[PDB]
Amino acid sequence: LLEAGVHFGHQTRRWNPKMKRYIFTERNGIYIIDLQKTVKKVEEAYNFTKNLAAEGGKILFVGTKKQAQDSVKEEAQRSGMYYVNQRWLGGTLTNFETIQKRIKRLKDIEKMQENGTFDVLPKKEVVQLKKELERLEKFLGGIKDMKDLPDALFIIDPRKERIAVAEARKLNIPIIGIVDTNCDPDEIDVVIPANDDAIRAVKLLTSKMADAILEAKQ
RNA sequence: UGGUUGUCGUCAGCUCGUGUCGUGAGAUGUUGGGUUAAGUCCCGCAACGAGCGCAACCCUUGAUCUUAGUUGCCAGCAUUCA
Secondary structure (H helix, E strand, C coil), X not given: CCCCCCCEEEECCCCCHHHHHHEEEEECCEEEECHHHHHHXXXXXXXXXXXXXXXXXXXXXXXXXXXXXXHHHHHHHHHCCEEECCCCCCCCCCCHHHHHHHHHHHHHHHHHHHCCCCCCCCCHHHHHHHHHHHHHHHHHCCCCCCCCCCCEEEEECCCCCHHHHHHHHHCCCCEEEEECCCCCCCXXXXXXXXXXXXXXXXXXXXXXXXXXXXXXXX
């Protein structure tokens, strides 16, 4: 674990008191996360992600934070599961039907590029249907092949991704969440008390879940 | 009284559904950052590509192609006052 920077939390002025149960001491005006609770909390997560994948359940990684974007993506694609990496769209889950309508439309613009329909209309169309595609793939490229709602979310930094959390709860979707000290643990079903700010930390902890999907599929 | 006249005729916006926010009336998107002649456009953002009015749809003029060459046209030939 801590070669990767997981133990390091946020400062003391931005704690949440519910994270007291997961904190072991403050040093240079930063809380330290208790690695002996982490490991067990990572192990409990790992079994819950393993069991869920073996039932054929679909997990949606969600890391819009600059230090999760690439991590999430690489680990979602490796794991053959959905991601959101760029911006969580209001009503991604609750309003899933109206997103589905743009996943159709994105896939419909691709088929227009693949049949050479883009050579018949132009110049005006093509500008605005690349521009629509570029924009749609950006935001919806991770969830492109998700036909039905995910059976759980893997979140990173719930306090940034509040909307994703808020949504998941409203559909009783289980969530799996890297919480730093700042973050409320009670929102989340399976909690991983850890750094979300350090790239190695996230990359480590996502990868172990990805692994946990891959080992179920075997 | 009908109808038809004059007379305030453009002059400024209304939104996609569901989702979201409030006990509720409502608010959001359709408060922000630039931009345009603009009711424009991009970037936004618990709202998400983009919608109706606008414009266009009608008619006319500006270039050129295809078809049609007669009663139109004559460059190239015969002509003659033409």
